[PDB]
């Protein structure tokens, strides 16, 4: 109702987050980066093949439950 499930994947590591529609995605990208022992700015985060700024929230991107956020390496 106030929360949404998202999956962040890089092709080999998949993480499910249950986060508020109003929470910024900076924490989600940060958690995904930390679990790989990297910083968030080293990774490209894409929704619908479009990059995501950290300040944006799932409500700001019209996202739905079970939506996928792809993760790649900067300068891939």
């Amino acid at each position: 109702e106030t929360h949404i499930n998202l999956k962040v994947s890089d092709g080999s590591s998949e993480i499910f987050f249950k986060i508020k529609k109003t929470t910024p995605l900076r924490r989600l990208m940060e958690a995904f980066a930390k679990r790989q022992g990297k910083e968030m700015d080293s990774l490209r985060f894409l929704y619908d093949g479009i990059r995501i700024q950290a300040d944006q929230t799932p409500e700001d991107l019209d996202m739905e439950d079970n939506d996928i956020i792809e993760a790649h390496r900067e300068q891939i």
């Binding site: 499910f16 249950k18 924490r27 958690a31 679990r35």
Partner: protein, 123 residues
């Protein structure tokens, strides 16, 4: 086999007698569904106090987390409430400061949901 599936289904549906029968027959008390939710997770989510108690008494992992990093304490603090269930979880060793992947404690969930009593009991 399928005893864990029946136990999860009964925890969802609120059958205490079926839960006890399945545990006596050897159902996995820590069996998880596709989202990683234990029967304790579902029971705390749906406000099933007796099922929560009997699972904790059968050795259910109170600190077990789903795929979102949410413990049964997280799910009980969220949405509905039922302060009795969070109290029983805490008395059975629920990690009050348990954080999900992005660091949401059950206290943060209670504060966001404005459940007052759960927030003060979480202390």
């Amino acid at each position: 086999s399928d005893l864990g599936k029946k136990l999860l289904e009964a925890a969802r549906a609120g059958q205490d007698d079926e839960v006890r029968i399945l545990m006596a027959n050897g159902a996995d008390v820590n069996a998880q569904d596709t989202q990683g939710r234990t029967p304790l997770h579902l029971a705390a989510q749906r406000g099933h106090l007796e099922i929560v108690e009997v699972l904790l008494k059968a050795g259910a992992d109170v600190n077990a987390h789903d795929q979102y990093g949410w413990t049964p304490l997280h799910l009980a603090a969220h949405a509905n409430g039922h302060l009795e269930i969070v109290e029983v979880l805490l008395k059975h060793g629920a990690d009050v400061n348990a954080q999900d992947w992005i660091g949401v404690t059950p206290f943060d969930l209670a504060v966001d949901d404005g459940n007052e009593d759960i927030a003060e009991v979480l202390q």
